[model samples]
Target: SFGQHLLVSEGVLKKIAEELNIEEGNTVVEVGGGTGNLTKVLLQHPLKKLYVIELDREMVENLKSIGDERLEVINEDASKFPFCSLGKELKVVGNLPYNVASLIIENTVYNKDCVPLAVFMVQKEVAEKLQGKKDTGWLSVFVRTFYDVNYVMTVPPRFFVPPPKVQSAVIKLVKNEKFPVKDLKNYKKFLTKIFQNRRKVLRKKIPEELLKEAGINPDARVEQLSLEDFFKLYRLIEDS
Candidate 1:
């Protein structure tokens, strides 16, 4: 049902939950509830409701067997599901499948109103991209534009059931109250186009007129731009 290398250890799961400070009466939505290891731990907390969304039928059956009054198991593809229907500003947590971690993050950011706090266990490289610095790439720019990301902890490859080939890390993403955007739909389009060709130099990649309108230096690389720069560029593109 899963890649051999993707399972995480019990200690790591517990640590992640503790770091998030999960408590009772909190509505927690988990993606990829494999084996329900993390789910079981989360149930121990004082949560008002626990929603586990998984794609595998077997996993759904397994979860149902637990029969906890607070547990709600959904056998659905998370990528296509309407997570926003859950509630407003719910806490979302997951040990994301490595293959679809980026997609999942994108979904979470796009539906920020539904999820205000997201704690994820993702590949270390992906975690680094979320916490942007001067050397950060397009992914960093995109993520920081909406959420304030912080790197929490790192876990080695040995911490899984099958033990993955690479290292992983836990990351916390909090939706910024002020994301510096007047229009979200237009900004999403602008950011999508700019980051699609991330390797190209900013001057060469972004249209000259667009850069001038945004008051951005075309010579800057995508990685060199800060979150503020992205907001400026997005506004410029939106106006144009």
Candidate 2:
């Protein structure tokens, strides 16, 4: 046990694997791969290779026992994995642990060049943010800047063996080449700064002059701003 709630929903696992649409010669990474439940489904795909990142040594050993040459078990933390080193246009998929899901998802967003597709099973609230379906915040803005997120499906708590206390949902993120952000680190910093007090109006965070200059309402709250609005604010701030 990785001290993690694993997905025992075999049907959901099959759907997750299919969502990847693994093609010939594609490389895939699976995060928080507990005991290879989904790993077995992914291996059935025609992908060239699959890397399972797990923090627990016992889980890693269990994964390697599957005897699939296409699968490699890496005993490492998923959040810090060098996703970019995996090469371009790879797929990343997982039933992520709720605690560090944000970190792992942010890491994947930062390496959008390598990952053309990422499908994750996370808390329903987190899925909403990623999809900007509701409660849009800094994470929503930052992630949407680079990815076209789609709300896939929801899995009830009872579906997992050691069911999670909260509901879980799956979301698919495909890189949107339209918004190419070269300075992701700085952009993220800007979003985080503005949304530090998400409920507060922009006037409280950004300078009134800058807000006016950007043609944005000084009283606009963070969640009220769209991806385009955030981009405009970010550009103005970086220029000044």
Candidate 3:
């Protein structure tokens, strides 16, 4: 009957809760909060309040049953939550659904205000993408540009009650104060043009002079350049 692949590892719970070291008056959120395992641990640290969001009605009931006045149990899809509803800096921590983890991250990171921080258990591949290693992708580039992202821990699939098919890891993202975009809509449009063919060689689509002007090689594929090069390319196309 487990639709969310509920996590129940004691060691993992302690590790995640301790990672933030959140103290009094700090606001935080936990999603995919099945049965309050992580929620219980997050409470032990003591702070202003904890908002735990889940999609299932039954799961929401179980969560509210915990009777923690400070814990606000909301039965809602996390991918569509109104992040702007909350005031002040927010920190989010949880294990995200493998399929919708990207959407959840997009919601948290791209919400009108960048959350001060978010720590998530995501697919190992996602963790790599956050780092935007030599092997790059669109989300990888965008996430790195706006956040100080890094891998904090590697979690084997067995850690979950119903082990997931793919591997998993924990990554931390702290929003950067100087994220370049004031308009996310346009910024996304800008990223799409250059990375639609992420593996496409630049020479075929972009000019040699422009590539050199951006200090990049004409033969480099879309994902081959550094974040700066992508920034440079966006400015190039934006101005032209």
Candidate 4:
């Protein structure tokens, strides 16, 4: 591995900011500000405040050394961090730690009011999961229920200081105020059960009576169901 170097290039960082349409007065919460490379670009906008959450003590200190008034660095676990404290309707941007990127997204989506939009750099596989289709797994169901996720761009392995073995991609998740799902808790449970054995027929996972109640064919694969269908299935299961 390379010495304490950042992965995302400055050029790519600029593209992310532009794609997100980051404005000057927007409040931004950045996770894993390894070298502040992206932070430097974010500061160029009219950012009202910037909250940077990082676990590495050295990187926190390094970011703090810059001593910019708008920058607020918090040394903590990004996954369990209280992002809601950043205030409601905030934008999140970061080159998240590969190990916990999905967890961070799960937490943010569950607390969508605090995070209206997010532009993240994550492993391409994980990015695909966020923008999952009918074939997507539980994580995809978990995410799409709250946000409209999109694949923004892809970066090659050679783009990093110590390039990752796999490619990276940028994704945008914008919270949908008018999401059709009303029972998030039930949806979460249903999605988890369905994707637990995604390859298995839907009828195999639930009782036959339940499938009939939901008006779903027992032989249907979980991958073939859309978000709307999933919601309908959840309601059917609940009523059954």
Q: Which predicted model would earn the best TM-score? A: 2
Worst 10 residues of 4 by lDDT: 1-10
> What are the TM-scores, per candidate, against the unseen true structure?
0.90, 0.94, 0.91, 0.90
Off by over 4 Å in 4: 1-3, 33-35, 177-186
* Candidate 4: tens digits of C-alpha lDDT, residues 1-240: 213576667788898888667776788888854546777788888888988888877777777876579999888877888788778768888887788887888778766868888998888888887788423778777788788988999988787877899999899988875346665666677788788867789778878787676677889988877777777677777776
TM match of model 1 to true structure: 0.90
Global lDDT of each candidate: 0.76, 0.83, 0.77, 0.78
Which residue segments of model 3 deviate by more than 4 Å?
1-5, 33-35, 112-114
Per-residue lDDT tens digits for candidate 3, residues 55-142, read: 7787777777777778887777788887657656788888887778887887786763737788888889888877887355777777
Clashes of each: 6, 0, 0, 3
* Residue pairs with backbone overlap in model 3: none
Q: Per-residue alpha-carbon lDDT of model 2 for 49-140, expressed as tens digits?
A: 99888888777777777878888877777798878876776799998887898989999988888999999999999998888866677888
Question: Which sections of candidate 1 miss by over 4 Å?
Answer: 1-7, 33-35, 180-186
lDDT of 1 by residue, 71-174 (tens): 99887777667788887757888888888888788778767778878899988888887887524655566667778898999888888766667888899988
TM-score of 3: 0.91
Cα distance off (Å), candidate 3, residue 14: 1.3
**Candidate achieving the largest lDDT:** 2
Count steric clashes of candidate 2: 0
Regions of model 2 farther than 4 Å from truth: 1-7, 33-35
